[PDB]
Amino acid sequence: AANNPAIQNIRLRHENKDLKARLENAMEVAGRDFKRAEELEKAKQALEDQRKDLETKLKELQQDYDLAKESTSWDRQRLEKELEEKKEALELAIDQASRDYHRATALEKELEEKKKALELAIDQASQDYNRANVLEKE
Amino acid sequence: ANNPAIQNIRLRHENKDLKARLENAMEVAGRDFKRAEELEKAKQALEDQRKDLETKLKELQQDYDLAKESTSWDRQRLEKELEEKKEALELAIDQASRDYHRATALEKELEEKKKALELAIDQASQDYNRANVLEKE
> B70 and A65: CB-CB below 8 Å?
no
- Furthest CA-CA distance within chain B: 196
**Phi and psi, residue B2, nearest 5°:** -115, 65
**Which of chain A's residues have a Cβ under 8 Å away from the Cβ of B53?**
51, 54-55, 58
Distance CA A88, CA A97 (A): 15
Interface test with B, best of A22, A39, A73 (most B CBs within 10 A): A22
Interface test with B, best of A45, A72, A90 (most B CBs within 10 A): A72
Q: For residue B92, give the chain A residue with the closest CA.
A: A93
Ranges of each domain in chain B: 1-137
Which region holds residue A100: left if phi is over 0, alpha if psi is between -120 and 50, else beta? alpha
Distance CA B90, CA B133 (A): 65
CA atoms within 13 A on the CB side of B3: 2
Domain range A1-138, CATH architecture: Helix non-globular (6.10)
Method of determination is: X-ray
Distance CA A7, CA A9 (A): 5
CA atoms within 13 A on the CB side of B18: 19
DSSP string, B90-117: HHHHHHHHHHHHHHHHHHHHHHHHHHHH
Domain range B1-137, CATH architecture: Helix non-globular (6.10)
Distance CA B95, CA B65 (A): 46
